[PDB]
């Protein structure tokens, strides 16, 4: 007969203004990861905030983000050229998806990217952004490998000296404002919601209502949708237990 969206009570605003508006985004091989928790995340505000050339959300619709509570939200941010933006997705292959940043096949979160040619491209060439180019094995999901040791591509050992069959693993991009549209830096921000809902700490605004007992209600307890009659019970719940099932 009525809905009762009884979310946890918290008023902190998630620092999406400190991950999407950072002056410097980390290099793709050393992508910054920020764990966001204990705050209210207004994903609609960040959705309609700029010109996001790519807002692919995998496993959850962008509009439904305000109606869910997530256990952990990670904001992996980096800078990638235009042609390699497509490689930031599950089931992708290439230098970016294997040597720099690997998204798991069970990825659950949004992938956000916008063409930032006014901040990460300089006339002489911006070489602060480096992508790994040679590695022994492809990266496991969500792994950062910032080792700059010379990769031995031949039988003869390199012994830390680059030369024949010895190359430096990291190669710069060198963005310029007159580069191609597919060769401009795209400041990617990959949100990875840890969809567990048990210690749900990041939530949408979703103004709560008063709990209604002993009547058929369309409850929305902490992101656990359904329908039933919420009756107070004498269940011996432990302090660290949220839902019984």
């Amino acid at each position, epitope marked *: 007969t009525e809905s009762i969206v009884r979310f946890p009570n918290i008023t902190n605003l998630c620092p999406f203004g400190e991950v999407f508006n950072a002056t410097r985004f980390a290099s793709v091989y050393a992508w910054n990861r920020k764990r966001i928790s204990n705050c209210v995340a207004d994903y609609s505000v960040l959705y309609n905030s700029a010109s996001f050339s790519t807002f692919k959300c995998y496993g959850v619709s962008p509009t439904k983000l305000n109606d869910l509570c997530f256990t952990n939200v990670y904001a992996d941010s980096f800078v990638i050229r235009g042609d390699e933006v497509r490689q930031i997705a599950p089931g992708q292959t290439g230098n970016i998806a294997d040597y720099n940043y690997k998204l798991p096949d069970d990825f659950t979160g949004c992938v956000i990217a916008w063409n930032s040619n006014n901040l990460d491209s300089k006339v002489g060439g911006n070489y602060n952004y480096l992508y790994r180019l040679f590695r022994k094995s492809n990266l496991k999901p969500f792994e950062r490998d910032i080792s700059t040791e010379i990769y031995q591509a031949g039988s003869t050992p390199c012994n830390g000296v680059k030369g024949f069959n010895c190359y*430096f693993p990291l190669q710069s991009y060198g963005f310029q404002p007159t580069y191609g549209v597919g060769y401009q830096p795209y400041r990617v921000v990959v949100l990875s919601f840890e969809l567990l809902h048990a210690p749900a700490t990041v939530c949408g605004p979703k103004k709560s209502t008063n709990l209604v007992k002993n009547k058929c209600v369309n409850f929305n307890f902490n992101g656990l949708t359904g329908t039933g009659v919420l009756t107070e019970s004498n269940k011996k719940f432990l302090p660290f237990q949220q839902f019984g099932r």
Partner: antibody
Amino acid sequence: QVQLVESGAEVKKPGSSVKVSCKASGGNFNMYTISWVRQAPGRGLEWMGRFIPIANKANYAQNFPGRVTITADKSTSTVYMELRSLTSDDTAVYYCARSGSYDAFDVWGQGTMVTVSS
Amino acid sequence: AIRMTQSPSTLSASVGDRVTITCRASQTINSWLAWYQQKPGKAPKLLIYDASNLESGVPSRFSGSGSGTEFTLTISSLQPDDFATYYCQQYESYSPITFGQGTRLEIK
């Protein structure tokens, strides 16, 4: 503690050429770019060129067309900046600066005083 | 080529006062701008980078602000050791990087 050491003072004649050095000691030489900054007496600083070890490229200032040719020996982590066609207005201390981490010249060399006169 | 302009070119102040230096660009260089300090006979040392941060080891009295085309360096409590020439870099175009004309700070 990265330390940059340059060559000694040089005295040349107008119309000749000079070539200074900048020995990069410590850290990783393959990532940070070395930028050469000159300062004529009584005047502000002036930028000359950049050596980009990661891309193995060298850039020169627009005001110096072909006058500056920057090379380096990555084996010994030594950067050489060559200035051609010295004149009376090129008497300046030629610093070498390491635009590390945040593109700013955090580490500056001791600077060599290059004097061009008869 | 982006041209940088400083103001005032020559300034004088006493110990413990407040000093403001304005280095205005000609084009939008976002927030890419660094502030140096060159005591005579020494190599300039970095003070501010990205136009607002503070370089490690720099005394906290140095503070920078501004973005776009006009920037500003300010010293909360001027000290005798802080009398030198302050330059502003514009590392938004690497062809060519243009320093400021130089702001010499003198004892009043």
